Write an enzyme that holds these catalytic residues in place. Structure first.
Site, PDB file in Angstrom:
ATOM      1  CG  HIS A  40      56.456 -15.693 -33.159  1.00  0.00           C
ATOM      2  ND1 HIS A  40      56.945 -14.612 -32.600  1.00  0.00           N
ATOM      3  CD2 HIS A  40      55.105 -15.439 -33.382  1.00  0.00           C
ATOM      4  CE1 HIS A  40      55.999 -13.737 -32.470  1.00  0.00           C
ATOM      5  NE2 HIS A  40      54.893 -14.227 -32.935  1.00  0.00           N
ATOM      6  CG  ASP A  84      60.427 -14.054 -32.530  1.00  0.00           C
ATOM      7  OD1 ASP A  84      60.282 -14.850 -33.443  1.00  0.00           O
ATOM      8  OD2 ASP A  84      59.539 -13.419 -31.978  1.00  0.00           O
ATOM      9  N   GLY A 175      48.653 -10.069 -33.853  1.00  0.00           N
ATOM     10  CA  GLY A 175      48.361  -9.582 -35.224  1.00  0.00           C
ATOM     11  C   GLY A 175      49.459  -8.582 -35.567  1.00  0.00           C
ATOM     12  CB  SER A 177      53.716 -11.231 -34.049  1.00  0.00           C
ATOM     13  OG  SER A 177      53.284 -11.407 -32.699  1.00  0.00           O
ATOM     14  N   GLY A 178      55.926  -9.514 -35.647  1.00  0.00           N
ATOM     15  CA  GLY A 178      56.709  -9.439 -36.920  1.00  0.00           C
ATOM     16  C   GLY A 178      56.885  -8.034 -37.406  1.00  0.00           C
TER      17      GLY A 178
HETATM   18  N1  LIG Z   1      51.554  -7.750 -25.680  1.00  0.00           N
HETATM   19  C1  LIG Z   1      52.267  -7.647 -26.777  1.00  0.00           C
HETATM   20  N2  LIG Z   1      53.081  -6.621 -26.935  1.00  0.00           N
HETATM   21  C2  LIG Z   1      52.173  -8.625 -27.786  1.00  0.00           C
HETATM   22  C3  LIG Z   1      52.922  -8.470 -29.002  1.00  0.00           C
HETATM   23  C4  LIG Z   1      52.865  -9.394 -30.044  1.00  0.00           C
HETATM   24  C5  LIG Z   1      52.056 -10.467 -29.858  1.00  0.00           C
HETATM   25  N3  LIG Z   1      51.818 -11.437 -30.663  1.00  0.00           N
HETATM   26  C6  LIG Z   1      50.970 -12.194 -30.037  1.00  0.00           C
HETATM   27  C7  LIG Z   1      50.499 -13.398 -30.566  1.00  0.00           C
HETATM   28  C8  LIG Z   1      49.467 -14.101 -29.953  1.00  0.00           C
HETATM   29  C9  LIG Z   1      48.998 -15.290 -30.461  1.00  0.00           C
HETATM   30  C10 LIG Z   1      49.555 -15.813 -31.604  1.00  0.00           C
HETATM   31  C11 LIG Z   1      50.608 -15.161 -32.286  1.00  0.00           C
HETATM   32  C12 LIG Z   1      51.176 -15.741 -33.445  1.00  0.00           C
HETATM   33  C13 LIG Z   1      51.546 -17.101 -33.471  1.00  0.00           C
HETATM   34  C14 LIG Z   1      52.081 -17.703 -34.608  1.00  0.00           C
HETATM   35  C15 LIG Z   1      52.260 -16.940 -35.755  1.00  0.00           C
HETATM   36  C16 LIG Z   1      51.909 -15.613 -35.751  1.00  0.00           C
HETATM   37  C17 LIG Z   1      51.382 -15.030 -34.618  1.00  0.00           C
HETATM   38  C18 LIG Z   1      51.050 -13.956 -31.739  1.00  0.00           C
HETATM   39  O1  LIG Z   1      52.059 -13.271 -32.383  1.00  0.00           O
HETATM   40  C19 LIG Z   1      50.611 -11.788 -28.834  1.00  0.00           C
HETATM   41  C20 LIG Z   1      51.329 -10.673 -28.757  1.00  0.00           C
HETATM   42  C21 LIG Z   1      51.349  -9.781 -27.679  1.00  0.00           C
END
Ligand SMILES: NC(=[NH2+])c1ccc2[nH]c(-c3cccc(-c4ccccc4)c3[O-])cc2c1
Ligand SMILES: [Ca+2]
Ligand SMILES: [Cl-]
Length: 223
Positions: A40, A84, A175, A177-178
């Site tokens: 994503h 993912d 922020g 993510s990944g």
């Molecule tokens: N509670 C957690 N452990 C968690 C972990 C990773 C996450 N990533 C995100 C997230 C929220 C909004 C947009 C993106 C996003 C969307 C598209 C591209 C990159 C990031 C997120 O990864 C929430 C989020 C919450």
């Protein structure tokens, strides 16, 4: 990362920042020309930034390399976030040293209880947005499958695992993510999703990397 600590400059040498004029996701360097991130986080115009600590200041040790191609897993489902994972090939290889190093893929999956290190430049507030300049770290354990499934009934597939604290207070967040979940020196997870950040009984969910090692290997070998 909510409830974590400042890692210390370059103490997580395999951490990369995916940048398109701002930081939008993290990733892990697994060899000198390939990075693993979340599907994503895919977009075009990705510049991979290695050897970073403060992402808003060039402090030295940084290497900015453009992505030559990004390979989203073919069975990625954007509605369930199943599969993912994404591989990014760098335009030129990176110079590895003590500040920029790759992390090993696992040979076996980890067990519940295993303590891992999660890192990233994501939000540090669960209620609000505060983005850090330097890299944050959090030590968190992998939860058992039952606790994970009881927290997210009907949304956990065999390619996901939960890690964190059910009492709330410490979690990865937007922020992050990944990015990497490293346990015993092996990359066992990729930050994928969660409900809010650091909320009680809503742990973070991660892509279970041990399930994709042959796929990563075969894909890199043919690209
Ligand atoms: N509670 C957690 N452990 C968690 C972990 C990773 C996450 N990533 C995100 C997230 C929220 C909004 C947009 C993106 C996003 C969307 C598209 C591209 C990159 C990031 C997120 O990864 C929430 C989020 C919450
Ligand atoms: Ca910097
Ligand atoms: Cl279920």
């Amino acid at each position: 990362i909510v409830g974590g600590y400042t890692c210390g400059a370059n103490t997580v040498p395999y951490q990369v920042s995916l940048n398109s004029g701002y930081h939008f996701c993290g990733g892990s360097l697994i060899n000198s020309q390939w990075v693993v991130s979340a599907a994503h986080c895919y977009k075009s115009g990705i510049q991979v930034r290695l050897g970073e600590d403060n992402i808003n200041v060039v402090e030295g040790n940084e290497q900015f390399i453009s992505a030559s191609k990004s390979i989203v897993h073919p069975s990625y489902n954007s509605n369930t976030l199943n599969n993912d994972i994404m591989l990014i090939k760098l335009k030129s290889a990176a110079s590895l040293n003590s500040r920029v190093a790759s992390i090993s893929l696992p040979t076996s999956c980890a067990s519940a209880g295993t303590q891992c290190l999660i890192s990233g430049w994501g939000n540090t507030k669960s209620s609000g947005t505060s983005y850090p300049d330097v890299l944050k770290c959090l030590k968190a354990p992998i939860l058992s499958d039952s606790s994970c499934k009881s927290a997210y009934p009907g949304q956990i597939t065999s390619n996901m695992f939960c890690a964190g604290y059910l009492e709330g207070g410490k979690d990865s967040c937007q922020g992050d993510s990944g990015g990497p979940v490293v346990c015993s020196g092996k990359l066992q997870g990729i930050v994928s999703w969660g409900s809010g950040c650091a909320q009680k009984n809503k742990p973070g969910v991660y892509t279970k990397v041990c399930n994709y090692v042959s796929w990563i290997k075969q894909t890199i070998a043919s690209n």
